[PDB]
Amino acid sequence: FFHDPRSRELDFSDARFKGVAKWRFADEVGMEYGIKGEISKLRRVFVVEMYVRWNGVWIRALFWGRGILEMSVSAYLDRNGKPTCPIEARSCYIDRENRRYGEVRDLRSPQDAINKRESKLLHMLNNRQAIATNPEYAYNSDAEMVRKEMSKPDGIIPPGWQPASMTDLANGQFALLSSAREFIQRIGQNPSVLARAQLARQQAGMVDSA
Amino acid sequence: LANGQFALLSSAREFIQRIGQNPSVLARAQLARQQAGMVDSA
Amino acid sequence: SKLLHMLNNRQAIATNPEYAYNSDAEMVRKEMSKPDGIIPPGWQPASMTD
Amino acid sequence: MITCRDIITLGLQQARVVPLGREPKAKEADAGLTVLQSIYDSMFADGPLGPFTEVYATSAYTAQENERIVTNGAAITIPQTITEGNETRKPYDLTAIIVINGAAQENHVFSLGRWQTAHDLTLNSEAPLAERDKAGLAALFAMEFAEMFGAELPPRTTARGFRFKGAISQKLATKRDDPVYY
Amino acid sequence: MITCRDIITLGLQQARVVPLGREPKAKEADAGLTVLQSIYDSMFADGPLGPFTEVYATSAYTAQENERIVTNGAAITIPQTITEGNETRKPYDLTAIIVINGAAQENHVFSLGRWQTAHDLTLNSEAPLAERDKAGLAALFAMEFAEMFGAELPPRTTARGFRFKGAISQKLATKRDDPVYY
Amino acid sequence: MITCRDIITLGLQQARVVPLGREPKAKEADAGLTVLQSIYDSMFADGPLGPFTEVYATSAYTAQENERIVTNGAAITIPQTITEGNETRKPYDLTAIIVINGAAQENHVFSLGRWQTAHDLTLNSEAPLAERDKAGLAALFAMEFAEMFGAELPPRTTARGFRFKGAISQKLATKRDDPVYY
Predict the structure, then answer these.
(1) Nearest residue to E12 (alpha-carbon basis) of E102, E112, E119, E147
(2) What is the DSSP letter of E91?
(3) Which residues of A touch C40 (CB under 8 A)?
(4) HSE-up of C7 (CA within 13 Å, CB side)?
(5) Cα D145 from chain centroid?
(6) Strand, coil or helix: what is D34?
(7) Is F22 helix (H, G, I), strand (E, B) or coil?
(8) Å between C30 CA and nearest CA of chain F
(9) With an 8 Å Cβ cutoff, are A192 and B36 in contact?
(10) What pairs with residue D53 in β-bridges?
(11) DSSP assignment of F23-39, as one string?
(12) Which among F166, F170, F178 has the least Cβ separation from residue C30?
């Protein structure tokens, strides 16, 4: 679908032109409008319809990358008698500068905070960072080889290294994921999927999706 | 860091029952499934 | 966003100014805040989990 | 211009092995050069001058901050000014640049408006980053250099040198932003 | 006008190495200058004189508070009065200004109604911020300068010098606002 | 080119057994070679030069990082550049390569843009990875080599050598990535 900018309204009343802008097969275009081929099989072209208000009338035109194919006054009338467009459409929400977002423009910021606050905890509850304590018995084996021996349960650890794990500030993460598993259920997952007996959904659930 | 793993498996045994195992296998009396269970599988 | 910033970072204080003051300062406290880290001696991970 | 031999003269009469007003001899002030070279060379390798970034370009590359250049034949120019979107600033305080050809290392460090040189440090050339303090750099030198002689440094001036090592291991001079209340 | 050599004379007879009433000699009062220069120069670099702000302007710029000027050819004028919306005040107590040309640093500090100078500090020029106390600045000097000689400072007057270093590391003289009950 | 005998000369006058300016004799500077060989050979076997990977190929194989080659008759070439999808980089800092024929081990190590050799280390050949510091490698040598004589190293310079052993046991010089907030 293909409309103009500078159309503030979500019913497309203020629009000047609207069209369909498709991809077709080159067989089923040239052998439909008399254009000769390659101007192989399954070659794709880019024909595009267009309903432009050119003066008081509505011109219908359809063209491609070179030349037009047909162009005439639109055949369909309206309730006033004058020729108009048949294309009709509607958007969900509008912004100050002309954006057309939907419903899942929201539920992205509260949904990247469930996927990310889950992979942080899985990374933090398997790894034990290793600090050096005695710089004579330590500084002897290695550094990066030793902390991979602390994080797996079948390991041998040399002397002088201390397994200081980050099993703190994880109860601050569980209480911060569970604040975003609950908002994602309260702004989005209202449409009669929450489980009262036809009162907390007949007047309380269907008025937020009105 | 095993009580941090039990609290992270039990967060995935509960989501797997809430997105998938809705189709009238959860156990109200023909209200939490006649208008609440069969509208997610619509 | 204050809590998300405060529950991933552990500010590092200097304790022993001979084994510390040797590696770096700003490189060390980025090794405390990530779980796959190596920490030199002389630095103490005082976090703000209060 | 604080020369290299002013530190070794100040370092030796710091640990009270040469008297006040007399200068070191030839064998004393030529063993101190090899150990004062060693402390400056162990600061760019892996020490308080910050981590470095690997790069390998055989072209007319110009160096960035904290970047260890290991090119073989090239023209590596240390920048004087940096334009980050017409924010024409000088480089940060104490950020180093290494350029390594086949066998010759040339380190660099920018301390107070000037690129110090800090390689092949002879007995006449100026010492890098000794403009910040002169009697603090001669106490970190003479802390372990005095152990070949009998003496050792007193504790009121030993902890002076451990302040100078920590004044360049933190880079806390440049003002930074306040807490935010986000 | 408290000269530089009054501190070194007071500093040496503080640590009871020269007697009362006699003056230091030539070699004694010329090694103390290089170490009294070093403590004043290690206070503007990174020390209790506060953090500094980077700037690079090649114009007729006038300096602000706590701003390290690293211009190359310019006319940098230290301000005397500051008009913050006809609040024509003097600058705050102990706030510094650095101006750095090609190779010459000139620090500045405003202590009690006057910009002290604190660079290239010779044996005749006045010492910066010694009007606040004279026998406290000669105990911070002679605390570590006495270690080249045999003696050391007694503990009743050592802790006098650690009060003077903390009296300028806090800037707690200027009155500030009360708690608020918000 | 820092030779092997410069370390043994610096190591012996570090522990103050030979005086300043005089060189070791023949029997002293030939027992120190067998023990300086032993510390370099106990770093590739099982020590701070990282774990190694077994391989057995009898072909024209070219070596990778950290790979102990135990071929019998072959042409094993140590790589100079590595192309990981046109990321034509040099190898990492301090990563070793071992090649073992029938009875001759030849270790290798890449420290600052050059493959050091570190085998059959004679009295004229250069010491591996002594460009990083010279007076730190002579304190790890002379820490236990001085025990055959009467003396021992002082504690201000003993802890210098335990920094050099930890500066190559961590490989913390190369900059790595920040925390992520995943």
Answers:
(1) E147
(2) P
(3) 132
(4) 20
(5) 17
(6) helix
(7) coil
(8) 6
(9) yes
(10) D67
(11) PP-TTHHHHHHHHHHHH
(12) F178
Taking the C-alpha atoms of residue F126 and residue F123, their distance in angstroms, rounded to an integer, is 8
In this structure, the strands spanning A130-132 and C38-39 are parallel
Alpha helices in A42-159 (DSSP H): 112-124, 147-150
In chain F, which residue's Cα lies nearest the Cα of C28?
F172
* Experimental method reported for this structure: cryo-EM
CA angle, A176 as apex, B40 and A106 as ends, to 5°? 45
To the nearest whole angstrom, how far is the Cα of E81 from the nearest Cα of chain D?
24
Instruction: Measure CB to CB from residue F51 to each of A135, A138, A145 and give the nearest one.
Output: A145
Amino acid E100 reads I
Compute the distance between CA of residue F163 and CA of residue D89 in angstroms, rounded to an integer. Answer: 36
| Chain Cα centroid distance, residue A68 | 35
Place of tokens 């590092």: C12
Q: Please give the radius of gyration of chain D, using alpha carbons only, rounded to the nearest integer.
A: 19
Q: Resolution (in Å) of the shown entry? A: 3.8
**C-interface mutation test, from D169, D170, D172, most C Cβ less than 10 A away:** D169
Task: Give how far B38 is from chain A: nearest CA, Å.
Answer: 9
F14–D31 C-beta distance less than 8 A: no
Are C33 and F179 an interchain contact pair (Cβ–Cβ within 8 Å)? yes
Counting Cα atoms < 13 Å in the Cβ hemisphere of E72 gives 7
| Cβ contacts of A170 within 8 Å, gap of 6 or more | A121, A124, A125, B4
Q: Which of A120, A142, A145 sits opposite F182 (nearest CB)?
A: A120
Which of C39, C43, C44 should be substituted to probe chain A, the one whose Cβ sees the most A Cβ atoms within 10 Å?
C39
Distance CA E17, CA E14 (A): 8
Residue F8: partners with Cβ closer than 8 Å, 6 or more residues away: F24, F29, F32, F33, F36, F141
H or E element, residue D36: helix D28-44
- Report the alpha-carbon angle C23-C26-C30, nearest 5: 100
By Cβ distance, the residue of C21, C24, C25 closest to D162 is C21
Query: What are phi and psi for residue D82, nearest 5 degrees?
Result: -130, 125
Which chain A residues touch F48 with a CB distance below 8 Å? 139-142
Residue A141 and residue C49 in contact, taking contact as beta carbons nearer than 8 Å: no
Subunits close to C (at least 3 CB pairs below 8 A) = A, D, F
**For residues D93 and D112, what is the distance between their CA atoms, to the nearest angstrom?**
7
C2 contacts chain D (CB < 8 A): yes
What residues pair up with A9 in beta bridges, in sequence order? Answer: none
Rounded CA-CA distance A157/A140 in Å is 12
Task: Using alpha carbons, select from D11, D1, D9, D8 the residue that is nearest to residue D160.
Answer: D11
CA dist., res. F47 & res. F36, Å (int): 15
Distance CA(D159)–CA(E144), nearest Å, equals 10
Helix or strand holding residue F116 (H, E): strand F115-116
Does A touch C (3+ CB pairs < 8 Å)?
yes
> Given an 8 Å threshold on Cβ–Cβ distance, is C19 in contact with A131?
no
Distances in Å between the Cα of D39 and the Cα atoms of A133, D5, D128, F135 are 25, 15, 12, 8
In the numeric block, the tokens 């006033």 are attached to A80
Q: What is the dihedral of CA D12, D18, D22, D26, to 10 degrees?
A: -70
Q: Which residues contact F73 (CB under 8 A, 6 or more apart)?
A: F58, F101
As a whole number of angstroms, the distance between CA E88 and CA E95 comes to: 17
Q: What angle do CA A122, A125, A127 make, to 5 degrees?
A: 105
Minimum Cα–Cα distance from A131: chain F residue: F170
In this structure, what token pair is assigned to residue C27?
């490189």
- Between CA F30 and CA F28 the distance in angstroms is 6
Q: Left if phi > 0, otherwise alpha if psi is -120 to 50, otherwise beta: which for E16?
A: left
The closest CB to that of C5, out of D166, D171, D182, belongs to D182
Token pair, residue E145, equals 């300068």
